[PDB]
Amino acid sequence: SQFMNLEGKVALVTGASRGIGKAIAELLAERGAKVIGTATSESGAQAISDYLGDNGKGMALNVTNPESIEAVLKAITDEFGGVDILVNNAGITRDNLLMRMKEEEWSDIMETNLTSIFRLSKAVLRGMMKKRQGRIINVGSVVGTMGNAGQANYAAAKAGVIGFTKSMAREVASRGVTVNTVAPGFIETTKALNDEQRTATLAQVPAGRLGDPREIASAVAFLASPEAAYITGETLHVNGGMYMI
Amino acid sequence: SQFMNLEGKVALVTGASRGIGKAIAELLAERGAKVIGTATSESGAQAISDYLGDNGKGMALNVTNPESIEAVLKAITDEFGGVDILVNNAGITRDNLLMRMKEEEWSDIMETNLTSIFRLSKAVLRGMMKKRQGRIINVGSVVGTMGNAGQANYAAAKAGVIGFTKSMAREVASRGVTVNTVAPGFIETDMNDEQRTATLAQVPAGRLGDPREIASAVAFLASPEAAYITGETLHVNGGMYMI
Amino acid sequence: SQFMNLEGKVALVTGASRGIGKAIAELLAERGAKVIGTATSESGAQAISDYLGDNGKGMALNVTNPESIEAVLKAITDEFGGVDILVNNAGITRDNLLMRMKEEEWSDIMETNLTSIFRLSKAVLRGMMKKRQGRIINVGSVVGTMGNAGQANYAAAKAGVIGFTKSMAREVASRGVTVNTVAPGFIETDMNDEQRTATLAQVPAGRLGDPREIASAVAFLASPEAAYITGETLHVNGGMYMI
Amino acid sequence: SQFMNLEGKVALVTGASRGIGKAIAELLAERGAKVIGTATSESGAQAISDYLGDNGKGMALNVTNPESIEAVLKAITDEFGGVDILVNNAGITRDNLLMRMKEEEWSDIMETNLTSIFRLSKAVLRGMMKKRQGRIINVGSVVGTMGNAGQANYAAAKAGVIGFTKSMAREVASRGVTVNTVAPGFIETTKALNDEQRTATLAQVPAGRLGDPREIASAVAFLASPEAAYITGETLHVNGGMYMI
Ligand SMILES: NC(=O)C1=CN([C@@H]2O[C@H](COP(=O)(O)OP(=O)(O)OC[C@H]3O[C@@H](n4cnc5c(N)ncnc54)[C@H](OP(=O)(O)O)[C@@H]3O)[C@@H](O)[C@H]2O)C=CC1
Ligand SMILES: NC(=O)C1=CN([C@@H]2O[C@H](COP(=O)(O)OP(=O)(O)OC[C@H]3O[C@@H](n4cnc5c(N)ncnc54)[C@H](OP(=O)(O)O)[C@@H]3O)[C@@H](O)[C@H]2O)C=CC1
Ligand SMILES: NC(=O)C1=CN([C@@H]2O[C@H](COP(=O)(O)OP(=O)(O)OC[C@H]3O[C@@H](n4cnc5c(N)ncnc54)[C@H](OP(=O)(O)O)[C@@H]3O)[C@@H](O)[C@H]2O)C=CC1
Ligand SMILES: NC(=O)C1=CN([C@@H]2O[C@H](COP(=O)(O)OP(=O)(O)OC[C@H]3O[C@@H](n4cnc5c(N)ncnc54)[C@H](OP(=O)(O)O)[C@@H]3O)[C@@H](O)[C@H]2O)C=CC1
């Protein structure tokens, strides 16, 4: 149908080799987008190419590296034209209580989960602004809003993603670009967590289950759609009731 | 496709004769739902029947009247079985600065915009809970979260809708029912040239939203795909407010 | 000192016979305010007069009764002049899961916990606006923001208090009146051994709050120092929720 | 009185040489605290010593420098014992629209306004946790929550401060330490802004005026008080109605 249809749009999804990023890439391609997913290695990029088939391709990207970012965008732009939908999914955890938290575990989180969104967003935004159409969608976390002990660095980065999102949303709203965050709760990815730890996390989820990566993909696809043009500066929580704002 | 597919679901959309409620009803029917839309008059109900065709029908409903609510649900339940998706859209404004605000302008807002959601939600929830599947989606307002001068009654009701939503979401999450709010900004609907520019001035998007844009957000939350969203307020306001 | 000094201010604290309302009344009187606390009975009013001594007095008030409200304000206004600080503390619970929730348990909550704030606020606001100085401070609840299963009515009312607060804050900010909400978590007050540990389990602080801790937050917002805070919800809940 | 009394508490207030940080330092000293305020130079430190008199002193601190931080805390700890109240006030702006925003304007904001709070908080928290009593109060900004065009970096840092605050609040609540943010709106400091720009900002303030630095000091003093023990993980907005959460 013409409902939630991304035909003619070019989507870049960072960290698309597995889990949530993969589900996002697959669903955007199902809705008609031409999708470039990224991994940190060529092997990972190839596997992304393998699952996207004629609907897009894989490329190697380190989101902390300016020259990598430039190489990937020029390659995309040459072949596909300018990016219409940016999904900043790539991210990491470096968990520790503050008294144990290393300088590098702080800085690596800031770099990968926050500074990267500044860099990538800045590198796609000019085209979007010229076309008067764009989507920037960040994958945040319930922890960004809720906080979590042992994840102060992660929480800071994810919270900063929202502050950036709101500010960019104000900056570019008049030129037809939206900027938003999807904040997952606990999603099956998480596996191999102790039996003890899962039940304890699950105990805080009214839904009484982990979310599926597809459920995060669906929310992203929605915000990426033409139908979602009047949503901007928003944080959409998909966490089974774990937190309610 | 199977994507955002509501075939087999029965949807009740209150206040579906025009604007946002109409757009909601049309979109849910387009995605496959069997839709009952309501108006406050039989004429209104007929027009709703006219635009839904074989995808549903219209019925007369006053959401402040227990006996009307009971009559409508029994009629729906007899013909279509139990409601799968409840869209509480019906609502009104009774604007005034507090010093000018009449007892009835307060109470009519509380009754129409808030107590109604308690009544209707309670009247569909048992079936949903038995089937272990349900959607309750409330149409709120940016004013519920932002506040607005001259709309304290409206803001109170719309804010109370969220408190109710969050509490019902906790209550029914383990039995597969989601409860959520969609909060529109300023949408081109029935409700000065001067006042519009002044409102628009607070919208970064630099336009009013279209009713279809509110419909799209509701359809999304109504979908099987939106099962892990509950207790949420989804803001569709062009950047007018950002939480 | 001149720090957090309420000398010369007239404070009305509804539901001041015990718990949080009592602690509020005592603290505002300690900071220099002339305090009228209320209870629902004359016996309760007398006890309030007993603990306030020369710093204020007690009066009987039912916040759901227009004529009671009018009688109390005229009496205050005659004796003490117009109210400078309004603390809307009076409130109740009528807990039940939605499927068990009676029409009266809904309506009694709406009336006592929400409509009352419209009535009382409207009845003090004109004077405050004329003097270009005022404080309206509502006692909400973490449940207003968090939701709680079995308390959908309460949550709706307490959430609606915020919508009202934000709208009134916009309406009266230019005339020097602030309107705010203090949202307690679980506080040691009248309201199982099992249920307490379960509630405590959700409090990082690992204890219930003291009524005095809610009093302190109210006194702060009531102060001249808090003039640039308005439309705010100040959460005092030991980490139970974090917005 | 015993109401809002900080006698016996040691307070460290970063960036206390002027405006909000100065007003904070003065008010905490008025309520009985022993106050160490900091500036980036010895001259600035001396002026802080001059206004605090016998109620505290000034020290030179660069909050982006680990060795500076260590030197200041050891000096405080030697003389006054361990810090009871930490006020992270030091911060900067590096304003620009994203397309003009330099790598350094991003990174300098992250370093000064966010990473600094990780470093300083970590360096005081052990003592607080051992004593089972502490206050960490961050000076954020309405922009952290509201977003602002031309301030995406600032907004990201200030938003990240909240994510960090919430997480630290969960981590240390059981050991009697609170962690909170005070978020000022537009405060008279701001001066020498165009006549045009002020009216435009003021137009968004229902209160119809800028806030006074003292009004931010009062909120901080409140949260620093024993009376505020049951407030943690909170963001207290003092913005004249400019934004309402
Ligand atoms: N899992 C959960 O419960 C939750 C997840 N989070 C967020 O969801 C997003 C994805 O989550 P999840 O599916 O669990 O993550 P995964 O670890 O499954 O996927 C990680 C992806 O990120 C890429 N990546 C890591 N570092 C870099 C880098 N420096 N440059 C470029 N790419 C990099 C990886 O590439 P490669 O394949 O080469 O390793 C990989 O494709 C993240 O932003 C995460 O913070 C959100 C809520 C909770
Ligand atoms: N317009 C906007 O910008 C915004 C809309 N709001 C909310 O969206 C919802 C719909 O708004 P909008 O489409 O603009 O409203 P309209 O006035 O355009 O339509 C209102 C609908 O509700 C029905 N209705 C009114 N009172 C009752 C009642 N007592 N019982 C049953 N039905 C009733 C009306 O039926 P009939 O045709 O018979 O009168 C009509 O179908 C409302 O809840 C409103 O508060 C939310 C954000 C802002
Ligand atoms: N306890 C808690 O943990 C929390 C408290 N809440 C809120 O704080 C407020 C006070 O709570 P708490 O001190 O625990 O309550 P209590 O039941 O301990 O005291 C209630 C007070 O309100 C008065 N009151 C009750 N109904 C009316 C009425 N219809 N008209 C006038 N006064 C009335 C009572 O008077 P009388 O003595 O004559 O009955 C009493 O003085 C309430 O709004 C409550 O919802 C907020 C967060 C949680
Ligand atoms: N002004 C406003 O309207 C608003 C202010 N903000 C926030 O309030 C806080 C203070 O604001 P304001 O009073 O305007 O700030 P000022 O610029 O008046 O004060 C700046 C202070 O921070 C210190 N500082 C700057 N960089 C460093 C550094 N690297 N290491 C240590 N100290 C440093 C300065 O030291 P030195 O004296 O040596 O220069 C100075 O003492 C900041 O966090 C700011 O972001 C919050 C809301 C809006």
Q: How far A117 CA sits from the closest chain D CA (Å)?
A: 11
Residue closest via CA to ligand 4's atom 35 equals: D39
Please name the residues in contact with D243: beta carbons below 8 A apart, sequence gap of 6 or more: D142, D145, D146, D185, D237
Inspect the interface and report whether the beta carbons of A147 and C242 lie closer than 8 Å: yes
Using the mean position of ligand 1's atoms as its centre, give its distance from the Cα of residue B65 in Å: 52
The pair of three-digit structure tokens given for residue D128, joined into one six-digit string: 């607080």
Q: Could you tell me the residue ranges of all domains in chain C?
A: 1-243
H helical segments located in chain D: 19-30, 42-52, 66-80, 103-109, 116-131, 142-146, 152-172, 195-202, 213-224
Residues in A touching D110 (Cβ below 8 Å):
110, 114-115
Q: Whose alpha carbon is nearest atom 39 of ligand 2?
A: B40
Contact A163 D157 (CB under 8 A): yes
> Does D229 sit within 8 Å of C3, measured CB to CB?
no
Secondary structure of chain A in HEC code, one letter for each residue: CCCCCCCCCEEEECCCCCHHHHHHHHHHHHCCCEEEEEECCHHHHHHHHHHHHHHEEEEECCCCCHHHHHHHHHHHHHHHCCCCEEEECCCCCCCCCHHHCCHHHHHHHHHHHHHHHHHHHHHHHHHHHHHCCEEEEEECCHHHHHCCCCCHHHHHHHHHHHHHHHHHHHHHHHHCEEEEEEEECCECCCCCCCHHHHHHHHCCCCCCCCECHHHHHHHHHHHHCHHHCCCCCCEEEECCCCCCC
**Which residues are within 8 A (CB) of C148 and not within 5 positions of it... i.e. 6 or more apart?**
B167, B170, C154, C155
Give the C-alpha separation, D154 to D144, whole Å. Answer: 7
* Ligand number with the minimum distance to the CA of A17: 1
Instruction: Give CA–CA dist D238/D137, Å, rounded.
Output: 14
CB contact under 8 Å between D207 and C173, yes or no, is: yes
Pick the CATH number of C1-243 from 3.40.50.720, 3.90.180.10, 3.30.70.260, 3.30.499.10: 3.40.50.720
**Contact state of B147 with C153 under an 8 Å Cβ cutoff:** no
Q: Which ligand 2 atom is the nearest neighbour of the CA of B92?
A: 45
Q: Which residues of D touch C1 (CB under 8 A)?
A: 1
B182 to A140, B145, C142: CA distances (angstroms): 21, 12, 22
From the number of C-beta atoms within 10 Å of its C-beta (0-12, 13-18, 19+), residue B108 rates as middle
Cα angle vertex B229, ends C148, B209, to 5°?
110
Distance D14 CA to ligand 4 centre (A): 9
Query: D touches which chains (3+ CB pairs under 8 A)?
Result: A, B, C
Quote the CA–CA distance of B234 and B139 in Å, as a whole number.
10
What is the Cα–Cα distance from B204 to A166, expressed in whole angstroms?
Answer: 11
CA distance C132 to C177: 7
* Per-residue b or e along D13-51, where b marks 16 or more CB atoms closer than 10 Å to that residue's CB: bbbbbebbbbbbbbbbbbbebbbbbbbbeeebbebbbeb
CB D21 less than 6 A from any atom of ligand 4: yes
> What CA–CA distance (Å, rounded) separates A17 from C222?
56
CB of D89 sitting under 6 A from ligand 4: yes
- Spell out the residues 6+ positions from residue C65 whose beta carbon is closer than 8 angstroms to its own: none
Q: Which two tokens stand for residue A220?
A: 């992203």
Beta bridge partners of residue C233, listed in sequence order: C181
Choose the closest CB to C239 out of D173, D215, D238.
Answer: D173
Closest atom of ligand 2 to B17 CA is 41
Q: Is A194 annotated as a binding residue?
A: no
Q: How many CB atoms lie within 10 A of CB C40?
A: 18
How many angstroms away from the CA of A225 is the closest CA of chain B? 10
What 8-state DSSP symbol labels residue C15?
S
Resolved by? X-ray
How many CB atoms lie under 10 A from the CB of residue B43? 12
Q: What type of residue is D214?
A: R
Among candidates B5, B8, B22, which has minimal Cα distance to B139? B22
Buried b (16+ CB within 10 A) or exposed e, A131-154: eebbbbbbbbbbbbbbbbbbbbbb
CATH fold of A1-245 = Rossmann fold (3.40.50)
Query: What is the DSSP secondary structure assignment for residue B201, as one 8-state letter?
Result: T
d(CA C66, nearest CA chain D) in Å: 30
Say how many residues make up chain D. Answer: 245
User: How far away, in angstroms, is C180 Cα from ligand 3 center?
Assistant: 18
- Which tokens belong to D237? 């907005």
> What are residue D187's phi and psi, to 5 degrees?
-115, 140
> For the purposes of burial, counting CB atoms within 10 Å of the CB of B201, is it exposed (0-12), middle (13-18) or buried (19 or more)?
exposed
A112-to-A73, A107, A184 alpha-carbon distances in Å: 18, 9, 18
Tell me which ligand sits closest to the C-alpha of residue C241: 3
Q: Comparing C-alpha atoms, which of B62, B94, B89 is closest to residue B187? A: B89
d(CA B209, CA B188): 6
Residue D20 CB less than 6 A away from ligand 4: yes
